Symmetry: D2
Amino acid sequence: ADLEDNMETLNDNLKVIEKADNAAQVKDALTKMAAAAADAWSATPPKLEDKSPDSPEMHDFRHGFWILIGQIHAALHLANEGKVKEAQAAAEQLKCTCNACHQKYR
Amino acid sequence: ADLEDNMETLNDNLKVIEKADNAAQVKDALTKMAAAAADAWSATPPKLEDKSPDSPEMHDFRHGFWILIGQIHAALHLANEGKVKEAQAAAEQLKCTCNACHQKYR
Amino acid sequence: ADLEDNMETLNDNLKVIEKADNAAQVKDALTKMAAAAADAWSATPPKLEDKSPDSPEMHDFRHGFWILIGQIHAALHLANEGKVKEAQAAAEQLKCTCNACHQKYR
Amino acid sequence: ADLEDNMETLNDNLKVIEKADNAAQVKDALTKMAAAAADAWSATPPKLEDKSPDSPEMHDFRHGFWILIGQIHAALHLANEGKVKEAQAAAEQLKCTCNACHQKYR
Ligand code: HEC
Ligand code: HEC
Ligand code: HEC
Ligand code: HEC
Ligand SMILES: [Ca+2]
Ligand SMILES: [Ca+2]
Ligand SMILES: [Ca+2]
Ligand SMILES: [Ca+2]
Ligand SMILES: [Zn+2]
Ligand SMILES: [Zn+2]
Ligand SMILES: [Zn+2]
Ligand SMILES: [Zn+2]
């Protein structure tokens, strides 16, 4: 899909997890975030369309999604062990990424 | 879906990656493998039907999918940087995780 | 060093982190655990000395340390951001690994 | 140690890995690179002396070492399975992380 669409999914499902109650809501939100993150991974942001597909900036932008995807799956690891509260905490801690990448490329 | 269905999707797209020609081909297979692996993550294999869901055996079973998905996303990292031959070798290498879990639980 | 020595380091520093107060104690304990885990990674446990260096069992044993090392560094990630309490939680959650691997190879 | 000292250790052992012949050689270099990277993790680069330690810029700076150490341990995974040529190619590939952080903060 489209990069701003992916970011909406990321942000909505982030708030679903905060308000979630059971383990199925959390696990399904995290699944949607993973899918969106993997979709964004191949997009070119506005402020980088001038640079080369193989530039260090583009590499760095993609690395931001690699990191986020790992964190989302580390949260899925916890939720699939039944530790729903610890998975919600991990989803909160994810924030350091959405903000590091925004500061540079949003 | 079924654990067996997930395993069929993993096996099929592994073969696709070994025969692919273009990066978009390798990229779509890895993406399907990641989803199948995430869905398999929650399953109980027959050999463990009797164990408690919080036993170490189920913990260890789920860890296999966590390591597998991490390897799939590392291959996706190479694919999305354009390095298709490297992604294909990455897909080849992750058969150590397939074989390790099969020896234990298949 | 020696595998039982590494396990002592792992277990001691695990309890240092629980009792820790500031961010330097936690970060230094986690550093020692990482070093021990990386040292154990190349050892052969008692109950596996019969099998081949390249057997799926040996692969699986090493994968256990790869996983643990990642978790320790995910905890270092948090401690280096100043989130000492969240790093202590992550060190607690590490437990699913020490127990999954013990159940199989200890 | 100094950030500059850590960078020198990283650079030196990268060269060692490209010229190595035996697995023990590749394994010791990666191990030294992992320690240098963990020690660099806490440093402040000159370009960021003015930013707050909890700014997104420092978060992003520290994330670079987290991704780098993950890549180093993935190469160590191959090395400890005996696949030295694969570990050497893994070391080669992680220069994307070197170049990405240098473009931003060196
Ligand atoms: C545990 C963590 C596993 C990992 C990692 C992989 N597989 Fe697997 N696989 C697993 C089980 C328990 C089973 C048996 C399920 C059952 O109900 O019997 C399987 C089975 C397969 C099969 C057989 C499928 C069939 O139609 O009968 C295949 C072809 C297969 N697995 C492939 C496969 C690949 C390619 C993997 C890595 C990419 C892999 N599996 C990992 C458990 C686990
Ligand atoms: C940030 C996350 C970095 C990563 C990843 C890597 N490096 Fe780096 N490096 C970084 C900085 C801020 C600096 C400058 C430090 C300063 O005080 O000026 C450097 C510098 C180097 C150097 C120069 C060393 C010197 O003696 O002047 C080298 C040779 C170097 N870096 C190598 C290197 C390699 C091989 C890396 C990946 C394996 C790598 N760096 C990653 C910040 C970051
Ligand atoms: C790069 C590595 C990013 C990461 C990680 C995250 N986001 Fe982001 N996001 C990024 C860009 C380049 C943009 C702008 C794209 C554009 O077309 O302008 C965004 C945008 C958003 C927005 C605003 C979207 C809007 O229509 O206003 C939000 C609310 C947002 N992103 C949320 C978000 C969250 C919660 C993240 C962490 C889970 C996250 N993003 C990560 C680049 C990157
Ligand atoms: C394999 C992947 C392991 C992981 C992960 C952890 N441990 Fe372990 N441990 C392992 C083995 C094969 C052994 C026995 C080795 C032997 O020579 O007999 C151990 C041993 C221990 C012990 C007891 C040591 C003793 O002298 O009695 C403890 C207390 C211990 N290990 C702790 C520990 C912790 C806290 C771990 C997680 C952080 C952990 N181990 C992981 C194999 C593996
Ligand atoms: Ca069948
Ligand atoms: Ca079948
Ligand atoms: Ca100097
Ligand atoms: Ca110098
Ligand atoms: Zn962070
Ligand atoms: Zn392996
Ligand atoms: Zn676990
Ligand atoms: Zn890269």
